[PDB]
Amino acid sequence: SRRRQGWLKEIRKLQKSTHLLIRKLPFSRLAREICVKFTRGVDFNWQAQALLALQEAAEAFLVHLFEDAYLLTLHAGRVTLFPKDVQLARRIRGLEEGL
Amino acid sequence: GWLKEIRKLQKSTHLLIRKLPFSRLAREICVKFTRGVDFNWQAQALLALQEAAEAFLVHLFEDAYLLTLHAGRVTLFPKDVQLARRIRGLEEGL
Amino acid sequence: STVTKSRRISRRPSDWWVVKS
Amino acid sequence: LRDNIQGITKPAIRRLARRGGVKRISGLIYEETRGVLKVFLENVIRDAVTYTEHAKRKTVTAMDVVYALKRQGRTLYGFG
Amino acid sequence: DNIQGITKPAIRRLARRGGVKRISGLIYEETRGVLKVFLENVIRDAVTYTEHAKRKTVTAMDVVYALKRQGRTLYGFG
Amino acid sequence: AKSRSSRAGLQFPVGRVHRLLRKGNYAERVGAGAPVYLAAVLEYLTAEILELAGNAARDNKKTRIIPRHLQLAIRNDEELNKLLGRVTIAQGGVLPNI
Amino acid sequence: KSRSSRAGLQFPVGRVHRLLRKGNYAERVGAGAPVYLAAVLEYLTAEILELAGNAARDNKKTRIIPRHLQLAIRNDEELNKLLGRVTIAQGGVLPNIQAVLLP
Amino acid sequence: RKESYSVYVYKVLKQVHPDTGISSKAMGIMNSFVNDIFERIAGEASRLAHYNKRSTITSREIQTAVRLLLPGELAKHAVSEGTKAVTKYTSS
Amino acid sequence: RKESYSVYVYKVLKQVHPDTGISSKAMGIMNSFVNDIFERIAGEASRLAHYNKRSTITSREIQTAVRLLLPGELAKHAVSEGTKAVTKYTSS
DNA sequence: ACAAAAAGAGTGTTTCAAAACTGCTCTATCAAAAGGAATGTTCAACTCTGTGAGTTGAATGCAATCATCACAAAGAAGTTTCTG
DNA sequence: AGAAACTTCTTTGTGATGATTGCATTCAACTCACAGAGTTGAACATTCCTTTTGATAGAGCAGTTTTGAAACACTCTTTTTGTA
């Protein structure tokens, strides 16, 4: 074949590493854009640690959300994660845990 | 028939479990949790405990049903209830 | 299973969403 | 075991599910729901009696239940 | 295009760490929307804390407090 | 012969809110405008809830507000519903869904 | 003659006492309350550090890292329930793949 | 002896709906709601003051705590009401 | 000038694994954990004292708060350690 | 009319704001560089649909039974006050 | 915290009884397997561009110290508000 289990190697490797998976500069650009969208006046500065903590929290949130949504995927007898799975996982988690 | 039953129940507010069976259940749980000293229960304490339990169960059934629909079924299953508890996440589902 | 310095068996979180009998 | 958990009858569980909007219920749902209700009550009652015996009382007050729920993350309003 | 900064392979790596085997194509837009919603909530509270202090820089502690009030305690930056 | 509530234009007891702030050991010291601001906020939220509850009692063709109407008012406003997201209204029922 | 030594603890009873007094928890603080609280805190950190040291040893390492803390916490049901809504920076996730995946 | 907010809830009800009564149990729910929101705001202001090493809860903490706890438009209007009240109060 | 439980966490680590070290990030996480648990227990004890109209936080509130916060087996050994420590302390 | 809480005044304390100052760290730039993202193709691997087989839950109608309501009595427990 | 006096609210018991539950069938309404049709996402090869890292100002702002004026706690008085 082309690749027996290429995804399985990727999963097994990612689930034992701890580094961030989004790139620092794109993430910080996005975060600063949102921050200025909130502040009508002069933008705030950002500690490097502030942006780092924000990215850590965001990535942990997204990973846990993907884990929860894949359970709904398998629940429907599928293996492909659909957007409706993510939406339902958000809806069941509630207003707080699911935004 | 189920439709008019649902529509009738969703516009009412009274408790759906019977007070005396609920009280017996709560009291036997309390005596299992005791440390050799029995407790009494204000009548309002049991009403409060039953108001919360029924609201919890109704909300849990709503969530579980969304899972049933996601799976393409209209019949609620124990796996749909178990999964709703798992997604709620160890404090809200418990 | 796995016991700490104190006689506290630290069981791993197997499964809790399923009811017991 | 003979009763006190079977006091939560199938018609009661069915009424709960219908108010939840469930159109059609399986048969194992009743035992599942009895188990869920039991584990819910065990958590609240434990905390309620913990409050009740921290106060040097012997009667579980409505406020003890309210505090137990509030500490578990569920706020109840009609019993202040 | 800051939201487009989150790339398809990055989202894929997130889903793989989450344990997903196969990923639809719309998951990428869905995930960008979800991440933006999450960030808006935390950043709003963080800058609220920063404004209550008479500061102009956002601090790791401001982010930590925002997350805790939203119910997501973070431990590495206290 | 003028209450602080009257001076602020409020119906909620500024003096009582001040006493509660001082005795709740929230801080070692309480400003003068803090209970005024807090009572104003509490009164505004009470007004917002009671208005919608009265509207629900009206179009429900009743005349007295009951817990059902408070529940309907809360779960039908998105902001109030987000605020009271983890709150159970005793004898409130649910909202009709499918 | 320190209170920690007098109670047999490694955690600072005097510091905990000061923090209780300065934290706006009550008007007055009993004498045994900081002792009890310091003992509880020391016990909890002992549990966590023991599990984390075991997790590090099973990885053939002699320094505990956030990954080991995360592994220790998420593998004990008691600690996993205590720190349910806690995110550990640089902790990763548990290596958990669904069974329907592995052929 | 026992404090409550029943008289004030009734006053504001007369203001907003001058012809609608309230049930005894609904009044208890409103008391619970007022106590709950008071506690939330006061605790948030407390920890704000503690974060900023301050020792007094001023009307500025109450404003920030209101901004943190309420959703968007609710918070906007609540801040407006509170500022209006403190201005009218000091202007005496 | 910035107090940290690093020295005490390190002492406990030396007691439990006499030849293991801990990274600086891991020590920061341990500090966050201790602060978090302290705040939880102290807040619960404060709420208890306020519920019972008491003005003192005694070792009885700490015990009850420990029973409320910690899951079962954790709480058993926690209260064991706490009562043991207060006995050893009052015995001097 | 009376008690209890709250305004009112005045005094002492204390604390938070303003100003000045220092250094540190955040921003903006740049310069390579190279590694990862973007692009395009494809086809095996997945999802969707429809059908038919197999299962089971709501509806129905009876008897049994027990939850509720009322009522009473007792007394256990909670409440209040006081003092050291 | 403990003791004493008071009260009030829970427990226990009795009786009716009629509403509610339980039990049995069934069959229409569902669930489930699957085979084929249709769709699509993982794998892969190549480009290049965007992120990373290392300075480098450089300056804006955070953190510290001091003074002090405002503001709040404390206390005694007056008075207004909710019972009588």
Which segments of H19-82 are extended strands (E)?
21-22
What does each C-alpha distance from F21 to B86, F25, H51 come to in angstroms?
Answer: 40, 7, 18
Query: What is the spatial distance between Cα G91 and Cα G67, in angstroms, rounded to a whole number?
Result: 4
Minimum-distance nucleotide, CA of B72 to C1'? K31
**Nucleotides on strand K lying under 7 Å from protein C-beta:** 9-11, 20-22, 30-32, 40-44, 50-53, 60-64, 71-73, 79-82
For chain A, what are the domain ranges?
19-94
Query: What is the spatial distance between Cα F2 and Cα F15, in angstroms, rounded to a whole number?
Result: 12
Q: Look at residue G27 and tell me if it is in a domain.
A: yes
Q: Which element (helix H / strand E) includes H12?
A: helix H6-16
CB H86 within 8 A of CB H59: yes
CB contacts of E41 in chain A (<8 Å) are 99
Query: What is the spatial distance between Cα B62 and Cα D56, in angstroms, rounded to a whole number?
Result: 40
Alpha-helical runs (H) found in chain D: 10-20, 29-54, 62-72
Q: How far is the CA of F1 from the C1' of K77 (A)?
A: 15
3-state secondary structure of D22: coil
Q: Chain B: nearest CA to C13, how far in angstroms? A: 11
DSSP secondary structure string, chain F? ---HHHHHT-SS-HHHHHHHHHHTTSSS-B-SHHHHHHHHHHHHHHHHHHHHHHHHHHHTT-SEE-HHHHHHHHHHSHHHHHHTTTEE-TT-------
Query: What is the spatial distance between Cα E2 and Cα B92, in angstroms, rounded to a whole number?
Result: 35
Handedness of CA A55, A18, G81, A93 (dihedral sign): positive
Give the largest Cα separation in chain F, rounded. Answer: 58
Q: Look at residue G103 and tell me if it is in a domain.
A: no
Alpha-helical runs (H) found in chain B: 2-9, 19-32, 43-70, 78-88
Query: What is the spatial distance between Cα B80 and Cα B84, in angstroms, rounded to a whole number?
Result: 6
Q: How many domains does chain H have?
A: 1
CB E15 within 8 A of CB A19: no
Residues 6+ apart with CB under 8 A from H87: none
Nearest beta carbon to residue A56 from set E16, E26, E74: E74
Query: What is the spatial distance between Cα E54 and Cα E43, in angstroms, rounded to a whole number?
Result: 17
Query: What is the spatial distance between Cα A79 and Cα A73, in angstroms, rounded to a whole number?
Result: 6
Residues 6+ apart with CB under 8 A from H13: F50, F54, F65, H20, H22
Q: How far is the CA of F29 from the C1' of J20 (A)?
A: 29
Structural domain boundaries, residue G77:
1-98
Say if the Cβ atoms of B94 and C16 lie within 8 Å. Answer: yes
Query: What is the spatial distance between Cα C11 and Cα H67, in angstroms, rounded to a whole number?
Result: 43
Query: What is the spatial distance between Cα E69 and Cα H67, in angstroms, rounded to a whole number?
Result: 12
Half-sphere exposure in the Cβ direction for G103 (13 Å, CA): 5
Report which DSSP code applies to H1: -
How is domain A19-94 classified at the architecture level of CATH?
Answer: Orthogonal Bundle (1.10)
Q: Chain F residue with minimal CA distance to H32?
A: F89
CB B58 within 8 A of CB D8: no
Q: Please state, as a whole number, how many other Cβ atoms lie within 10 Å of the Cβ of residue E6.
A: 23
What would the two tokens of residue F1 be?
């012969």
Picking from A5, A12, A16 by the largest number of G CB atoms within 10 A of its own CB, the best residue to mutate is A16
Query: What is the spatial distance between Cα B68 and Cα E34, in angstroms, rounded to a whole number?
Result: 24
Strand B40-41 to strand D59-60: parallel, antiparallel, or no bridges (unpaired)? parallel
For B14-89, CATH number out of 3.30.420.40, 1.10.20.10, 2.40.50.140, 1.10.8.870 equals 1.10.20.10
What does each C-alpha distance from B36 to B33, D40, D61 come to in angstroms?
Answer: 9, 23, 19
Q: Please state, as a whole number, how many other Cβ atoms lie within 10 Å of the Cβ of residue F76.
A: 13
Please tell me if residue F81 touches chain H, with a CB cutoff of 8 Å: no
Q: How far is the CA of D58 from the C1' of J76 (A)?
A: 10
Indicate the burial class of B56 (C-beta count within 10 angstroms; 0-12, 13-18, 19 or more). Answer: buried
Query: What is the spatial distance between Cα B72 and Cα B55, in angstroms, rounded to a whole number?
Result: 26
What would the two tokens of residue E62 be?
């401001």
Residues 6+ apart with CB under 8 A from A2: none
Handedness of CA C2, C4, C8, C14 (dihedral sign): negative
Q: Who among residues 23-62 of D has its Cβ near strand J, under 7 Å?
A: 24-27, 57-59
Q: Chain I residue with minimal CA distance to E77?
A: I28
Say if the Cβ atoms of H25 and D77 lie within 8 Å. Answer: no
Strand G28-29 to strand E22-23: parallel, antiparallel, or no bridges (unpaired)? unpaired
3-state secondary structure of H57: strand
Q: How many domains does chain G have?
A: 1
Q: Which amino acid is at C16?
A: W
Query: What is the spatial distance between Cα F86 and Cα D70, in angstroms, rounded to a whole number?
Result: 9
What would the two tokens of residue A10 be?
């990727």
Report how this structure was experimentally obtained: cryo-EM
Q: Chain I: nearest CA to C1, how far in angstroms? A: 15
Q: Which domains does chain E have, with CATH numbers?
A: 1-78 (1.10.20.10)
**Nucleotides on strand J lying under 7 Å from protein C-beta:** 5-8, 15-17, 25-27, 36-38, 44-48, 56-60, 66-68, 76-79
DSSP secondary structure string, I14-83? HHHSTT-EE-HHHHHHHHHHHHHHHHHHHHHHHHHHHHTT--EE-HHHHHHHHHHHS-HHHHHHHHHHHH
Q: Please state, as a whole number, how many other Cβ atoms lie within 10 Å of the Cβ of residue F85.
A: 12
Say if the Cβ atoms of D65 and B48 lie within 8 Å. Answer: yes
What would the two tokens of residue G49 be?
């550090």
Say if the Cβ atoms of G25 and F27 lie within 8 Å. Answer: no
Structural domain boundaries, residue H12:
1-92
Query: What is the spatial distance between Cα B45 and Cα B47, in angstroms, rounded to a whole number?
Result: 5
Which CATH number covers residue F47? 1.10.20.10
Query: What is the spatial distance between Cα A54 and Cα E46, in angstroms, rounded to a whole number?
Result: 10
Q: How far is the CA of B6 from the C1' of K21 (A)?
A: 20
Angle at D72 between CA F84 and CA H34, to 5 degrees: 35
Which residue shows structure tokens 């204000």?
Answer: B42
Handedness of CA A67, A73, A79, A82 (dihedral sign): negative
What does each C-alpha distance from C13 to D63, F66, G45, G96, G97 come to in angstroms?
Answer: 33, 44, 20, 13, 15
What does each C-alpha distance from I37 to D36, D64, H47, I69 come to in angstroms?
Answer: 29, 23, 16, 9
Report which DSSP code applies to C21: -
What does each C-alpha distance from A11 to A6, E14, F80, G94, G96 come to in angstroms?
Answer: 9, 10, 42, 12, 10
Q: Look at residue G79 and tell me if it is in a domain.
A: yes
Comparing CA positions, the residue from F73, G49, A43 lying closest to residue I22 is: G49
Query: What is the spatial distance between Cα B20 and Cα H16, in angstroms, rounded to a whole number?
Result: 41
- What secondary structure, in 3-state letters, does chain E show? CCCCCCCHHHHHHHHHHCCCCEECCCHHHHHHHHHHHHHHHHHHHHHHHHHHCCCCEECHHHHHHHHHHCCCEECCCC
Query: What is the spatial distance between Cα I73 and Cα C3, in angstroms, rounded to a whole number?
Result: 12
In the beta sheet, which residues pair with residue E71? Answer: none
State yes or no: chains F and C have 3 or more CB pairs below 8 A: no
Residues 6+ apart with CB under 8 A from D15: B9, B16
